[PDB]
Design a protein around this ligand. Structure first.
Ligand SMILES: [Mg+2]
Ligand SMILES: [Mg+2]
Ligand SMILES: [Mg+2]
Ligand SMILES: [Mg+2]
Ligand SMILES: [Mg+2]
Ligand SMILES: [Mg+2]
Ligand SMILES: [Mg+2]
Ligand SMILES: [Mg+2]
Ligand SMILES: [Mg+2]
Ligand SMILES: [Mg+2]
Ligand SMILES: [Mg+2]
Ligand SMILES: [Mg+2]
Ligand SMILES: [Mg+2]
Ligand SMILES: [Mg+2]
Ligand SMILES: [Mg+2]
Ligand SMILES: [Mg+2]
Ligand SMILES: [Mg+2]
Ligand SMILES: [Mg+2]
Ligand SMILES: [Mg+2]
Ligand SMILES: [Mg+2]
Ligand SMILES: [Mg+2]
Ligand SMILES: [Mg+2]
Ligand SMILES: [Mg+2]
Ligand SMILES: [Mg+2]
Ligand SMILES: [Mg+2]
Ligand SMILES: [Mg+2]
Ligand SMILES: [Mg+2]
Ligand SMILES: [Mg+2]
Ligand SMILES: [Mg+2]
Ligand SMILES: [Mg+2]
Ligand SMILES: [Mg+2]
Lengths: 328, 343, 132, 177, 208
RNA sequence: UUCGCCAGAGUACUACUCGCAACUGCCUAAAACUCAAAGGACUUGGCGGUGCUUCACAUCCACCUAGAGGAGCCUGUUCUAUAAUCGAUAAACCCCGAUAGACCUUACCAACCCUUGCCAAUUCAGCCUAUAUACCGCCAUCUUCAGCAAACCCUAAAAAGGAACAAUAGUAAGCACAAUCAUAGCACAUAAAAACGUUAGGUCAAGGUGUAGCUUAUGGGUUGGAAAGAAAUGGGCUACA
């Protein structure tokens, strides 16, 4: 299928030129972020699966990596490990073992000469380097891979890295390394806002069990809550609901140092109490140092409550309660 | 009423009950007659009951340089056309009802000895056109499965041979009989034996072989004793190229064991040239009808030993009682000298 | 076991189309609807009339083009004019194809009191998506 | 092994001793056959299942330009070649065994597959090997590193000489016409 | 169930975070608690940072709650505490000077002491051996003992009272009787202990 | 090189003889009669109140909560009773076909009328007549179990099986599983999906149907009735505070 992909490349180039001409943009500056945008407009297919939508990419992404020819016209295989089944993986293993042996002999000679110039280049914790996954290795090597052979390759790579690294060995071992994303879970702290000559003004939002609450906090007033135009004592007759309001302020010892006005809609009494508690906790982050906001998030004030009522299932009573199952 | 109709595919699928639940485990096979007729075989899309000849479907669009108007056939023409259409129905039914008789290798209702055609060509392009194959045994093999229960699979023994001394055998097992035939044919060519045939009509010497539990006694025969052997050994020898042979099978008559033993015995033959090489003596044939003429068949190439072999006054040969009875004329069985058909 | 709009898997030699290879639970996920109209919206009406017209069109076209139809028709309803898109095997001559399309464009129009458009795409054979 | 008795010189306090006269006699024929196969443009595969000299065998095959197999030998490799290797693949014309026995102390799969597929096999056999199916058995030691290196270098130089002489013969053939 | 296995239980104690510098062993754990990107579940509505709430009181209220009337259960608990406080105050004022230094009026401590007094020491497990069930004596876990202590009192006060008598009124008397080691809950605990002492010879049937 | 035995199985370590300190005894030892088999070994499933490891997360127990079986009512069945439908009727039926019965629905019955009787026509229409043990269409159960399976290859033959990662004959498209998708952000959960087959499982009464039966009738229309509870039982509501 070597010629088929080549023909598809020319057809894709011609189609890209035509798409640029019909869309009105410069074909020279036409890129994939414009190709997909124009496709989504010309063929607006509304489907839940993204892969089912129309797509026009370069053939190298659409078609998978096709295996190259292995033997010439005379039938003689090119690579010397063709009859091993996996001529790419086994060649890689052979090269890795040869480099390991070269490193070992060079280190033995250096120790005989009583010289130590190498360093430990295996600790990549600050960089955030990891080993290749099976899919990543199968992307590099066109042939299919297994689990045991992948484990052997990883365990040989770590053996090679555990030895005094050479000059050309480090770059070879680095191409099998992948960077990981930031695992920091620190939330964004809203800056203090000053609106209408008002100092220490902040806003927060919360949601819990179909209840939306928006709370504005002023850091210069006394401690009181105004909910929906009425005081919290009147709006929450139940003491537990008022304890929900007290939970964030008591954790920060800011009972009588902030004035809060809340607007909460939806849900019941407890759902509204939870929503306003979450909104107040998220809004108080601006008035507190970075040390206690983490304490609040560890105490469970800055995290949402995904506990939502499950939909009732057909043939059941309450999405869990089954009907009376008669054995006979 | 029009919305209540369905398609012909569903109508036939429901009428034939091909995917019925009673024909799965084996409750069927009572009425084994499944026939589906395509109703759109000889129906012209333009023809109809009223006999209108549309310019775009029935008649050519332009005739005599002008356009044709909507016309209708006469009653006699419609009768002629419908008579031809009816005649086509019985013409097709005549072909459908006719069944060609199957091959009778050994009997009218068996697959033993029937011809299966030349084997399929190999991947590299080699074609086996001179090779002919025969089926020796077809057996329905059943296996017990956890879900279905009995699992019927057909196992077929198939022997290939070209008539020039090259032949082989194989076993193909598959769910379908045709698939088993194909698997056996495609696998027989990979295991081919070469049989040394004396004068290309008989074997060099008599062989008495004892397989697992089957005893095979084969004796060399002249040009006038053509293939007086078992009904399967005759087919195997016909495929190999042997035209004259006498073989007796005693003990178990298992087809696979018989075939394996026959092939082993034919492969373990000792050629006259091999005997001459191993004995360093001339091999001389004394033909009965050629008198005392010392015909030499094999020459001991190499060092010809001048020391004569030790002439034993009493040979200690492991004789056979059946052969002794045959030589002494004690074989009074009525089945030994029966007149049979030709090879 | 679910059996609605589901073609059972054979030994591995039957040809299936893209629409046939997808179960009905994949509708609007991997495959779309064969017909589009405004009758199946929230605040709209006249849905039964559209459904019966669509099914009559299916049954009429199946007999109109026997044996040469590749897959299910596409019935687009857009501002009082009805478009019917079909995929047909190139078994019939274009002389007969034009006769059939000219016949249908007027028959359906006069039967449903609305303008219709008929579009046919000729294919050498049925397109195979899964194992064939 | 019972079939190694004719190939043994004797036993020196429990350890069997392999005679070297027959070793050299077999090795001359083996090297001549390998050189002729290389000269006639034949595919030569060095097979050995032994986790001590795998890298050495791979390097020797790379230097020779011939192919090597020192990893786990798959089941239908030589037999089901059209499905294991590719649509149409040319099987090796010579198989050279550097270790007849595998890691499980059993006869190798290829030593039987080559006989099944009619592929000539030159093989180094120790006192515990089975030379019945090997076309050219060489009675020697396959456990000593110098012993392995000696055979590897002998086959390396045989292949190099065969290829160089083939090239010289072709160069002369070019001037012949 | 919506929370994944990576979610960790929150810490509500404010003094745990107020002084992290007083010890170094807790520092090594609380510094890596957030480093591993450990997600924390939402704090339950029942549990808060208030100093006047107790987990034992919350558990007892949850056990007394019928259906989902948490407000009614909380009102019953508050009324029971008020009743025990007033009954203790009445006896404090009716007693002389020497008894005032011994009688306790705090409801929380007397509730905890009554629960501990009615907590069983060992329980019985039915083990099937030879086709018959034997009540093998067995040591009980702390949570099981506390749950049994609460459940016995709740079951006794729900059924062994008159219709006119209210739940807080019955519970106030029962708490005092349990605190003074005179209640039917204590009698039931003694009965269980005597049954265990009778079946002690069958303790070899246990295999754990 | 010899001796003692073996001629289908049951009859039969039997009957009838001889011999024996044995007298319900031992040795030797048939026949009538019945069958086309009787037997030894092996493969794969299934099973095991066999044994050894790992499990059960609403599942078995150790344990938690709320109910049924007690009362009334509603409703569905099994029974008696009428001229008065039918099917389901172990898990997988029992507020099930029916997200639904005063006429119609309604296929049931009694009284009465019409017989090329819906359609352009048809020695034709029409049948809720039988067969779900002939079907398609749709589902139930194993079943949130993972296996099914085309093309090959191997076994000192092959019924069948095909594995050792420091690897011992296994490659394998595909369908399953998984992933993805939806519950408009992730994760979880739910939903959805769940192949090949087992139960000749349910459905000729959603609809058409192969076969066998009706045609002044098993077809088509109108009116009136299709009760009732001696009794038992399933599932729910109300409570017994
Ligand atoms: Mg509920
Ligand atoms: Mg016959
Ligand atoms: Mg026989
Ligand atoms: Mg050795
Ligand atoms: Mg007898
Ligand atoms: Mg006896
Ligand atoms: Mg006796
Ligand atoms: Mg349960
Ligand atoms: Mg209740
Ligand atoms: Mg009850
Ligand atoms: Mg009741
Ligand atoms: Mg009924
Ligand atoms: Mg019934
Ligand atoms: Mg059932
Ligand atoms: Mg009526
Ligand atoms: Mg009625
Ligand atoms: Mg009727
Ligand atoms: Mg059925
Ligand atoms: Mg699997
Ligand atoms: Mg097999
Ligand atoms: Mg596969
Ligand atoms: Mg999502
Ligand atoms: Mg998931
Ligand atoms: Mg589901
Ligand atoms: Mg899935
Ligand atoms: Mg049935
Ligand atoms: Mg039924
Ligand atoms: Mg019907
Ligand atoms: Mg019926
Ligand atoms: Mg009842
Ligand atoms: Mg129900």
């Amino acid at each position: 299928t070597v010629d088929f992909i080549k023909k598809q490349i020319e057809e894709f180039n011609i189609g890209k030129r035509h798409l640029a001409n019909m869309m009105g943009e410069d074909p020279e500056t036409f890129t994939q972020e414009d190709i997909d945008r124009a496709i989504a407009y010309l063929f607006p297919s509304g489907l839940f699966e993204k892969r089912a939508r129309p797509i026009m990419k370069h053939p190298e992404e659409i078609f998978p990596k096709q295996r190259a020819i292995q033997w010439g016209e005379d039938g003689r295989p090119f690579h010397f490990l063709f009859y091993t089944g996996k001529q790419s993986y086994y060649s890689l293993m052979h090269d890795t073992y040869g480099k390991l042996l070269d490193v070992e002999k060079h280190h033995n000679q250096l120790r005989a000469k009583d010289l130590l110039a190498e360093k430990t280049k295996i600790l990549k914790d600050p960089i955030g380097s990891r080993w290749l996954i099976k899919e990543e290795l199968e992307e590099m090597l066109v042939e299919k891979l297994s689990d045991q052979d992948y484990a052997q390759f990883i365990r040989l790579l770590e053996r090679l890295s555990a030895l005094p690294c050479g000059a050309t060995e480090e770059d070879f071992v680095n191409r099998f390394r992948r960077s990981i994303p930031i695992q920091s879970k620190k939330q964004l702290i809203e800056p203090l806002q000053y609106d209408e000559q008002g100092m220490a003004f902040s806003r927060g939002e919360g949601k819990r069990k179909t209840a939306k609450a928006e709370v504005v906090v002023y850091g210069q007033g006394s401690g009181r809550i105004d909910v929906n135009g009425v005081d919290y004592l009147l709006y929450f007759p139940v003491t537990q609901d008022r304890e929900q309001l007290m939970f964030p302020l008591h954790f920060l010892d800011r009972l009588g140092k902030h004035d809060m006005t809340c607007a909460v809609s939806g849900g019941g009494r407890s759902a509204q109490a939870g929503a306003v508690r979450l909104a107040m906790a998220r809004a108080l982050c601006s008035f507190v140092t970075e040390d206690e906001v983490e304490w609040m998030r560890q105490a469970g004030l800055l995290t949402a409550d995904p506990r939502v009522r499950e939909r009732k299932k057909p043939g059941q009573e309450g999405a869990r309660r089954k009907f009376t199952w008669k054995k006979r | 009423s029009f919305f209540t109709k369905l398609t012909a595919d569903e109508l036939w699928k429901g009428a034939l009950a091909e995917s019925g639940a009673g024909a799965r485990k084996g409750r069927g096979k009572r009425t084994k007659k499944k026939r589906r007729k395509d109703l759109n075989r000889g129906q012209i899309i333009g023809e109809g009951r009223h006999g209108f000849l549309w310019p775009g479907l029935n008649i050519p669009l332009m005739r005599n340089g002008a356009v044709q108007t909507i016309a209708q056939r006469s009653k006699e023409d419609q009768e002629k056309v419908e008579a031809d259409m009816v005649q086509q129905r019985e013409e097709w039914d005549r072909r459908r009802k006719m069944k060609v008789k199957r091959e009778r290798g050994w009997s009218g209702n068996t697959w033993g000895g029937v011809s299966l055609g030349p084997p399929d060509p190999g991947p590299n392009g080699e074609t086996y056109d001179d090779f002919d194959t025969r089926i020796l045994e077809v057996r329905n093999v059943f296996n017990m499965t956890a879900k279905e229960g009995r699992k019927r699979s057909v196992r077929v023994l198939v022997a290939v041979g070209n008539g020039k001394g090259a032949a082989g055998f194989a076993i193909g097992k598959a769910t379908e009989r045709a698939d088993a035939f194909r698997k056996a044919k495609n696998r027989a060519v990979h295991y081919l034996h070469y049989i040394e045939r004396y004068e290309d009509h008989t074997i060099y010497h008599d062989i008495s072989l004892k397989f697992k539990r089957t005893h095979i006694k084969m004796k060399k025969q002249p040009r006038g004793y053509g293939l007086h052997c078992h009904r399967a050994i005759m087919t195997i020898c016909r495929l190999i190229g042997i035209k004259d042979l006498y073989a007796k099978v005693s003990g178990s008559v298992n087809m696979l064991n018989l075939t394996r033993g026959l092939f082993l015995g034919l492969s373990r033959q000792e050629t006259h040239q091999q005997l001459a090489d191993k004995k360093s003596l001339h091999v001389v044939e004394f033909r009965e009808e050629c008198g005392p003429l010392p015909i030499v068949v094999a020459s001991p190439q190499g060092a010809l030993r001048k020391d004569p072999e030790p002439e034993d006054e009493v040979p200690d040969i492991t004789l056979d009682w059946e052969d002794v009875k045959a030589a002494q004329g004690m074989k009074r069985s009525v089945w030994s000298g029966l007149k049979r058909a030709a090879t | 076991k679910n059996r609605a709009a589901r073609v059972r898997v054979s030994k591995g030699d039957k040809p299936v189309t893209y629409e046939e290879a997808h179960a009905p639970h994949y509708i609007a996920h991997r495959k779309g609807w064969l017909s589009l109209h405004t009758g199946n919206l929230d605040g709209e009406d006249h849905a039964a009339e559209r459904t019966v017209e669509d099914v009559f069109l299916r049954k009429f076209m199946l007999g109109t083009f026997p044996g040469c139809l590749a897959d299910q028709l596409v019935l687009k309803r857009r501002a009082n004019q009805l478009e019917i898109c079909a995929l047909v095997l190139r078994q019939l001559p274009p002389h007969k194809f034009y006769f059939l399309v000219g016949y249908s464009e007027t028959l359906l129009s006069h039967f449903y009191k609305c303008p219709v458009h008929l579009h046919l795409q000729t294919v050498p054979s049925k397109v195979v998506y899964k194992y064939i | 092994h019972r079939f190694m008795e004719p190939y043994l010189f004797g036993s020196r306090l429990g350890q069997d001793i392999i005679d070297l006269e027959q070793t050299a006699a077999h090795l001359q024929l083996a090297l001549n056959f390998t050189a002729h196969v290389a000269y006639r443009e034949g595919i030569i595969l060095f097979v050995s299942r032994h986790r001590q000299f795998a890298h050495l065998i791979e390097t020797t095959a790379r230097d020779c330009g011939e192919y090597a197999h020192t990893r786990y030998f798959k089941g239908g490799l030589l037999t089901n070649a059209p499905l294991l290797l590719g649509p149409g693949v040319r099987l090796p014309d010579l198989i050279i065994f550097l270790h007849t026995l595998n890691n499980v102390f059993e006869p190798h799969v290829a030593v039987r597959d080559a006989a099944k597929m009619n592929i000539p096999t030159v093989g180094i056999v120790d006192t515990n090997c089975n030379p019945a199916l090997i076309t050219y058995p060489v009675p020697g030691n396959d456990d000593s590193p110098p012993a392995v290196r000696l055979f590897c270098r002998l086959f390396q130089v045989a292949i190099s000489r065969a290829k160089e002489k083939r090239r010289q013969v072709e160069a002369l053939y070019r001037l012949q016409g | 169930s919506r929370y994944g296995p990576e979610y960790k239980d929150p810490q509500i104690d404010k003094e745990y975070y107020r002084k992290p510098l007083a010890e170094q062993t807790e520092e090594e754990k609380y510094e890596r608690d957030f480093k591993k990107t450990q997600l924390i579940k939402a704090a339950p509505a029942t549990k808060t940072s208030s100093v006047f709430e107790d987990p034992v009181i919350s558990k007892f209220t949850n056990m007394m709650m019928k259906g989902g009337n948490k407000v009614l259960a909380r009102s019953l608990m508050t009324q029971t505490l008020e009743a025990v406080k007033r009954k203790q105050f009445a006896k404090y004022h009716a007693a002389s000077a020497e008894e005032q230094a011994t009688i306790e009026r705090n409801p929380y401590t007397i509730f905890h002491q009554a629960l501990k007094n009615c907590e069983p020491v060992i329980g019985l497990v039915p083990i099937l051996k030879g086709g018959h069930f034997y009540q093998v004596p067995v040591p009980l876990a702390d949570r099981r003992r506390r749950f049994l202590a609460m459940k016995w009192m709740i079951a006794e006060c729900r059924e062994k009272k008159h219709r006119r008598v209210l739940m807080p009124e019955k519970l106030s008397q029962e708490l005092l009787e349990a605190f003074h080691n005179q209640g039917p809950v204590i009698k039931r605990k003694h009965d269980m202990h005597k049954m265990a002492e009778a079946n002690r010879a069958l303790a070899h049937y246990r295999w754990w």
